[PDB]
């Protein structure tokens, strides 16, 4: 029951929010050559350490 923890709050359960943006700064350039605002794609992962 060894357990190395610290801050970085337990990937938590019970309900959170999912932000589904579209003009988030990186999404654009990697993915929005393909089209408009009627359809696009978005990283729902809000970690900036990721393309």
């Amino acid at each position: 029951r060894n357990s190395i923890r610290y801050s970085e709050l337990s990937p938590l359960y019970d309900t959170t929010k999912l932000y589904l943006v579209d003009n988030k700064s990186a999404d654009i350039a990697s993915l929005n050559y393909q089209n408009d605002h009627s359809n696009f794609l978005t990283t729902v992962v809000q970690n900036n350490d990721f393309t």
Binding site: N32, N35, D36, H37
Partner: protein, 51 residues
């Protein structure tokens, strides 16, 4: 011509890129093809003319 890239007023001018996600977006004399103003007709020249 006129480049908006660095601005939003575009959205005010009710004019916007069709792939709203890049930058080929400036408008030059060269793009508005056929869209030349007609020229306008001379009224007085038409009038006096009954020779």
């Amino acid at each position: 011509g006129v480049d908006f890239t660095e601005s939003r007023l575009s959205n005010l001018l009710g004019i916007r890129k069709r792939h709203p996600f890049q930058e080929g977006f400036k408008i030059m004399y060269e793009d508005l093809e056929g869209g030349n103003i007609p020229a306008l007709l001379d009224v007085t020249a038409y009038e006096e003319s009954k020779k």
